[PDB]
Design a protein around this ligand. Structure first.
Ligand code: SAM
Ligand code: DNC
Ligand code: MG
Length: 214
């Protein structure tokens, strides 16, 4: 047998162009529109992710939630030489898929994959992954972790003035406690980017929260 995540990977390996990150993204998006929905950020919201990366030019980018590697490929392809993406994924099989997808897309030199839970890895980023502060964070893991991991990132000293947090799914499925925190707090300057849930006409949005200092 096989799983949805394996079928998405197999579609890419068999139909996308090796070394062509854009072709990998398009193959995933086509498979998910035509065959089986999956929780990749997708094309519409992905254009917004792309725009945030282009506006901030992060040198150290952290992703929480890798899944099959769609967003890791999408983001990595816009980073400059010497920039790096650290992506944390709790499920070892998804992590294996993500590394296979990254490698196929020609992005392996940009990406450090970490297997584990964000809450376990964040407190180790400075000591084990040679992070000082982060330039940007993409939150796209289980939504009940968005608030507590944001507080962990801050308390661990990983945010600096101007660090960008970009959170998927703030409308659907929703992340209301995260939203109330960053919006209400004087420590974050927030902008809402409304769009659509991946591969659907359901409304969703992203929140961009720029840290302003403690
Ligand atoms: C929405 S999918 C990620 C999609 C990906 N960002 C993309 O756009 O291609 C969410 C993932 O977060 C992972 N996950 C859930 N809780 C986690 C945690 N605490 N730390 C790391 N990964 C987690 C899940 O195993 C799943 O792969
Ligand atoms: O249920 N969904 O439509 C989604 C969509 C998403 O984009 C997700 O990131 C998600 N999740 O992490 O649980 C779920
Ligand atoms: Mg999502």
């Amino acid at each position: 047998g096989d799983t949805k995540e394996q079928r998405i990977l197999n579609h890419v390996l068999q139909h996308a162009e090796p070394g062509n990150a854009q072709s990998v993204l398009e193959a995933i998006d086509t498979y998910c529109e035509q065959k089986e929905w999956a929780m990749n950020v997708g094309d519409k919201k992905g254009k917004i992710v792309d725009a945030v990366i282009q506006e901030h030019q992060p040198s150290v980018l952290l992703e929480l939630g890798a899944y099959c590697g769609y967003s890791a490929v999408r983001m990595a392809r816009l980073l400059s030489p010497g920039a790096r993406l650290i992506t944390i994924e709790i499920n070892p099989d998804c992590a294996a898929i993500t590394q296979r997808m990254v490698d196929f897309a020609g992005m392996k030199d940009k990406v450090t994959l970490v297997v584990g839970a964000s809450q376990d890895i964040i407190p180790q980023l400075k000591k084990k992954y040679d992070v000082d502060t982060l330039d940007m964070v993409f939150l796209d893991h289980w939504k009940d972790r968005y608030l507590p991991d944001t507080l962990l990132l801050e308390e661990c000293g990983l945010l600096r003035k101007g660090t960008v947090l970009l959170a998927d799914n703030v409308i659907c499925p929703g992340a209301p406690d995260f939203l109330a925190h960053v919006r209400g707090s004087s420590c974050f300057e927030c902008t809402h980017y409304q769009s659509f849930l991946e591969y659907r006409e359901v409304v969703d949005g992203l929140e961009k929260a720029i840290y302003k200092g403690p």
